DNA sequence: GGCGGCCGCTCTAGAACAGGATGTATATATCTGACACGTGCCTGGAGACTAGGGAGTAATCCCCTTGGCGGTTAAAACGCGGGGGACAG
């Protein structure tokens, strides 16, 4: 079978910011098992924001409020920022 | 001639300082065991298409929060007495 993991991905970005450093399988582990669980609770934040104003669908404002919920101080402006510049890089 | 005051002497102790002790910080030697590159796939997302439906926006409406007052008696605040408790020892 086929099971969905996020190791290459982290991978390159650490390559894109340090390219001196490695990894091991127990802290690709911890990084996997850490960007689940922020997955999981920004898409549910997402979902229960979408829930509240009766909102059938989840856009890029779902994920922005989602990250100034959870994200505190100013890691949730970058992250907007950050969003914001992908959101306009894809148009 | 006796006694209080003064200064030198020895006793005692706080503390800066140097030497021993033992568990870690490093300098190689070498093992070693996953790390990442390569290969071979192949299985999930992207181009493109069909269709439609829920929000963007406009309009209404009516509703409900903000400003803005006097009044009046509950209470914040200042201060005096004092009292029991936080903390040094």
Do not use: C
Not at 4 to 33: C, F, R, W
Not at 47 to 58: C, D, E, G, V
Request: proline fraction near 2%.
């Amino acid at each position: 079978t086929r099971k969905e993991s996020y190791a290459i991905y982290v991978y390159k970005v650490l390559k894109q910011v340090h390219p001196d450093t490695g990894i091991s399988s127990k802290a690709m582990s911890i990084m996997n098992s850490f960007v689940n669980d922020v997955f999981e609770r920004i898409a549910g934040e997402a979902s229960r924001l979408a829930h509240y104003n009766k909102r059938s669908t989840i856009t890029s404002r779902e994920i922005q409020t989602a990250v100034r919920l959870l994200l505190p101080g100013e890691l949730a402006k970058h992250a907007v920022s950050e969003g914001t510049k992908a959101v306009t890089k894809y148009t």
